[PDB]
């Protein structure tokens, strides 16, 4: 089928969307065309609906009608506000995920969450003794995780001039963010003012309300996402390389499949630890089934596969096509990202939707709610829910599409260094010789605007080509998986200086560092390296791309990546072009301001060339050659 | 003209809506009639713009299609999500003008605000002590002022299993809100949970939703919104009793006129006292004027009048007009609820728009940044530029249309109690005689749906008549007070059992307690009878109302009043109607939950039908007559 081609670049989805079309199944895809085309006000971020003085809308208009609100607000302000809002529930997204955590590692520190542990011990002293904890290098570990979660828990206050890891980004980025006055505060804080300045009759200037828009961001991603990663990292483990596969055919029809969904690990490490008690295995040799086997969706998929080799079924919109293969026995949501839509489909087949989260609540889903204090039996509770309805599989509707695709994951930045033989210095010396021209981050998701993953893939393989290294998170991870590029026999499809490099250290020519919110991984890597040497991020040969975003919190991804200096792609424009003043601001003003800006370009090829000039322009500036 | 007499009830607005006519000035009520009709999807709630996979809308269509967004969200997630946000951006006015009241404090106690103190010392240890600082009532003044700080910055934090002040709420209420998933926890932390459970793909029950939304208004009524006002009497004293003036007529020819609008008493306490030192004021009569002359606009005024007397110009729907009176030297703007179009109105005549705040920008307007370490200097320069401003005022161009009418404000709980004797008792003992039936609160704004204060007034009138005192703030005592009624005077206005109260203690019958976060104050009057008499919230014969709302700040209000157990009437609906099950929720659900609901009514007869209504029923289960 021609429209079942258009969707997707891959066979597993076409494969799918032909059985869900033949079972009378609606897909993303289908409800995205019923909502074609849609509100030109709404596209262009020219509607209000902030007080019921409106709704508003505002228009272009020779005679000068509905120019302004009814509060007198223009285009410039509506939009720069509704951006805002956006940025903000993107921020809120990761800091409530950050917050999760703060309070999994006081539970542990506590006493007060069977099953969960400090599995890193020494990066929790590392990081606690980075951040001030007194004799981190000695006191007991748990008394330690006490003071880090103090800390931790000090930047989701208001009593802060800057957040604890801000202090990772050179003296001339804070200095930047300073006079600006970007330089965030406080995590939950920072979208509080966003939501105060975007009430009517608060903050009516557009720039201004940008500005507060990166220090939103940057709360994130110097806040809520680092504290989440890091603190992932201690409780569950650091992330080394190793090897798993990717694609719907990771599900076994001969297992009971339990699919993982959304974002916290603090759910998904205790089902894969329920699964291998040895009377919950017997349970399910008891119902029929060969094994047990866990698979992981969106970002708790990435944090599975990143710590523990989980294979990956796949990413956003592979998430309904994971249950018309028929055989996900359950699936298990926490929250952020899931579509509810899968609650229907899970109930045209056997499978189990379990909601875990009080704040991911779904209409119609089997709520078994998992906090520390009771994740091991609660978990346990819910492969037993997930063996029962294997029990109940139509074996006739069962179609698993294809083979799974060999990946290599695990590249956190202790990894990279440690594959680097502990200091970044190999890999500034491979980049002064121009083996490597330059990095660039691939994050962000599927939309269904675009040929799924289409765009994803073209953007990577041109940038490899290109010498150019690829760091892989959040949805992309799946796209270049399944591309055949996360395996070090991949550096044959690299250029001669990536492959060289490649090849010495044995590793693919693109780096999965993780999920969403390990994208601050990589501003640590960047701020690293231009601590390292001695300048500002804006200086390094680094860029970023999100050529298949949907969310609010890839946009805020992409802000906070901007707002630190990296030069940010983006394959479709958030609701902004209604206001030429904000558009001239993110493609060209934030260049004068923060030394980056966004780019917008649907084209994956042409991303490639701007990616690419920024780099060779920021190597010149270095003094090294193209 | 019809229209203009449609437009508002008031002499002062009719006068300046047919100046503004004449000098080619639109105003809210022309951008109003742009706007209309407005879209049906944002009226009814059921447009989405949460990611880029939308816009989407739901409709209801033959063939089935656009029933869900893209991700599969229904009218009922998409509706009660947005009532979320739009409930935590009025949380979110609050929280940040709380925090900041925090931050003077923190600057008075560390000596660090030169021109602020401690204006009222019994009151900080009075608070103090009763939220848990140790030897408050003996230590030195600024120890308990920065342990006070301490307090209320942990409920900007993380870690508390509840807020503060919520402890004032009787137990039964508490526990119920326990139960349900209610209870305030942090003051940010709930508006950014809220921010968390609308993103795509998180919350995607409508019941769910609605529970955080009362969770997040309660964090504002018991956390944001009481910090500020608690704070605020503590920094620039606590109301009294005191006569001042209402409507355009308070503006003067012969004076430098200067209108504070916006929220913060940081910023107006302190321009009043520039206005005050004796070289400012004869550089105003080196200009030819009189004197100076400060008027308040809003909350600000509310703030201004509560504590200083002085004379408020107008409510929301009277500041442009304000300006074109033609004598309004300067605007001095700090943030929330301040019309963008002011800036363009200004620029019309003389006047100077002056932000002072980094959160209320505003493309054009002079930017004098204002801190508790700069405010003296700052204020002074800021006044110094209103009488520059008014030797270039006009003369042609000016026109003050009214009279100025007497009012009567300065009722915190503080004076209620005093003005009782210091007990609630005579209160309590009036309520079980039947003399006063019942107490409602009428808050909230005007909206340019409704003719200006003509449900306001409506309202209150039929209230007091029926024996039911009414509590006054925000915009409604603008209102009140261009009706008279907010004179003991006014007695003669309501029914016998209300007006033989009210002239045994010489009070009106409509008192005012404040700006929109001083509806804190009506809380804690609540859980202070509650607590007394060992019952509910939600058994008191209580009521609260806006019947002219318009922001979210206001619907922040009538949320944490619902979920604290207070009838609440609202003139207008949210943006709900598109979903059947929210509404159902709003306007019954709640009632078997928290023990109250919304009511939507723009009739105001029946508006007070409806309240009566509750409080009868309410005085009932109290064995009352
Ligand atoms: S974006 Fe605005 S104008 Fe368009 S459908 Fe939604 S509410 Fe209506
Ligand atoms: S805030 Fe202003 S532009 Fe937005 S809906 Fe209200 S009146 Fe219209
Ligand atoms: S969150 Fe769902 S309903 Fe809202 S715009 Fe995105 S796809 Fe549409």
């Given at each position: 089928s021609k429209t079942i081609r258009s969707r997707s670049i891959w066979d597993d989805a076409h494969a799918m969307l032909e059985k869900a079309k033949a079972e009378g199944i609606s897909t993303v895809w289908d409800r995205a065309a019923e909502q074609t085309p849609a509100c030109k006000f709404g596209e262009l971020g020219t509607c209000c609906r902030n007080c019921i003085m409106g709704p508003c809308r505002i228009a272009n208009r020779?005679?000068?009608?509905?120019?302004?609100?009814?509060?007198?607000?223009?285009?410039?302000?509506?939009?720069?506000?509704?951006?805002?809002?956006?940025?903000?529930?993107?921020?809120?997204?990761?800091?409530?995920?950050?917050?999760?955590?703060?309070?999994?590692?006081?539970?542990?520190?506590?006493?007060?969450?069977?099953?969960?542990?400090?599995?890193?011990?020494?990066?929790?002293?590392?990081?606690?003794?980075?951040?001030?904890?007194?004799?981190?290098?000695?006191?007991?570990?748990?008394?330690?995780?006490?003071?880090?979660?103090?800390?931790?828990?000090?930047?989701?206050?208001?009593?802060?001039?800057?957040?604890?890891?801000?202090?990772?980004?050179?003296?001339?980025?804070?200095?930047?963010?300073?006079?600006?006055?970007?330089?965030?505060?406080?995590?939950?804080?920072?979208?509080?003012?966003?939501?105060?300045?975007?009430?009517?009759?608060?903050?009516?200037?557009?720039?201004?309300?940008?500005?507060?828009?990166?220090?939103?961001?940057?709360?994130?991603?110097?806040?809520?996402?680092?504290?989440?990663?890091?603190?992932?990292?201690?409780?569950?483990?650091?992330?080394?390389?190793?090897?798993?596969?990717?694609?719907?055919?990771?599900?076994?029809?001969?297992?009971?499949?339990?699919?993982?969904?959304?974002?916290?690990?603090?759910?998904?490490?205790?089902?894969?630890?329920?699964?291998?008690?040895?009377?919950?295995?017997?349970?399910?040799?008891?119902?029929?089934?060969?094994?047990?086997?866990?698979?992981?969706?969106?970002?708790?998929?990435?944090?599975?596969?990143?710590?523990?080799?989980?294979?990956?079924?796949?990413?956003?919109?592979?998430?309904?096509?994971?249950?018309?293969?028929?055989?996900?026995?359950?699936?298990?949501?926490?929250?952020?990202?899931?579509?509810?839509?899968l609650v229907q489909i899970a109930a045209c087949y056997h499978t189990r939707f379990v909601t875990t989260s009080p704040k991911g609540r779904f209409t119609g889903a089997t709520h078994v709610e998992v906090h520390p204090h009771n994740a091991q039996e609660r978990c346990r509770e819910i492969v037993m829910l997930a063996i029962d309805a294997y029990t109940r599989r139509d074996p006739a509707r069962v179609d698993i599409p294809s083979q799974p695709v060999s990946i290599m994951s695990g590249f956190s930045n202790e990894a990279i260094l440690e594959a680097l033989g502990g200091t970044p210095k190999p890999l500034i010396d491979a980049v002064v010789a121009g083996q490597i021209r330059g990095f660039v981050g691939i994050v962000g998701c599927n939309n269904p605007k675009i040929r799924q993953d289409s765009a994803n893939v073209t953007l990577t393989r041109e940038l490899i080509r290109r010498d150019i290294m690829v760091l892989a998170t959040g949805c992309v991870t799946t796209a270049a998986g399944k591309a055949g590029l996360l395996v070090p026999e991949a550096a044959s499809k690299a250029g001669e200086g990536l492959a060289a490099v490649c090849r010495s250290l044995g590793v693919p020519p693109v780096l999965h560092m993780g999920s969403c919110v390990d994208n601050s991984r990589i501003l640590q890597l960047c701020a690293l390296l231009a601590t390292t040497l001695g300048v500002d991020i804006s200086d390094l040969p680094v860029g970023a791309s999100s050529p298949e975003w949907y969310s609010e919190k890839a946009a805020a991804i992409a802000m906070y990546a901007v707002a630190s200096g990296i030069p940010t792609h983006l394959g479709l424009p958030p609701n902004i072009l209604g206001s030429e003043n904000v558009t001239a601001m993110a493609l060209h003003g934030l260049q004068d301001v923060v030394g980056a800006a966004f780019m917008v370009e649907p084209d994956p090829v042409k991303a490639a060339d701007m990616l690419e000039a920024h780099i060779v322009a920021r190597r010149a500036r270095l003094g090294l050659t193209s």
């Open positions: 020779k005679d000068g009608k509905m120019r302004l609100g009814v509060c007198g607000a223009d285009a410039d302000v509506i939009v720069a506000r509704n951006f805002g809002r956006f940025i903000a529930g993107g921020a809120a997204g990761h800091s409530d995920h950050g917050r999760d955590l703060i309070e999994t590692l006081e539970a542990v520190a506590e006493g007060k969450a069977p099953g969960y542990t400090i599995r890193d011990v020494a990066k929790l002293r590392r990081i606690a003794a980075e951040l001030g904890v007194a004799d981190a290098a000695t006191r007991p570990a748990h008394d330690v995780a006490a003071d880090l979660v103090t800390i931790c828990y000090n930047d989701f206050g208001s009593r802060r001039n800057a957040l604890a890891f801000l202090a990772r980004a050179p003296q001339v980025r804070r200095d930047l963010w300073q006079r600006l006055g970007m330089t965030p505060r406080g995590v939950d804080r920072e979208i509080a003012e966003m939501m105060h300045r975007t009430h009517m009759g608060c903050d009516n200037d557009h720039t201004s309300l940008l500005v507060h828009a990166a220090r939103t961001a940057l709360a994130d991603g110097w806040g809520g996402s680092m504290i989440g990663t890091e603190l992932s990292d201690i409780l569950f483990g650091t992330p080394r390389p190793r090897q798993s596969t990717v694609n719907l055919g990771v599900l076994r029809k001969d297992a009971v499949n339990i699919l993982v969904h959304g974002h916290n690990p603090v759910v998904s490490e205790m089902i894969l630890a329920a699964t291998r008690e040895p009377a919950v295995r017997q349970a399910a040799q008891d119902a029929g089934a060969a094994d047990i086997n866990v698979a992981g969706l969106c970002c708790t998929g990435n944090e599975l596969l990143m710590r523990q080799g989980i294979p990956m079924a796949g990413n956003h919109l592979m998430t309904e096509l994971a249950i018309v293969t028929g055989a996900a026995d359950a699936i298990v949501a926490d929250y952020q990202c899931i579509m509810p839509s």
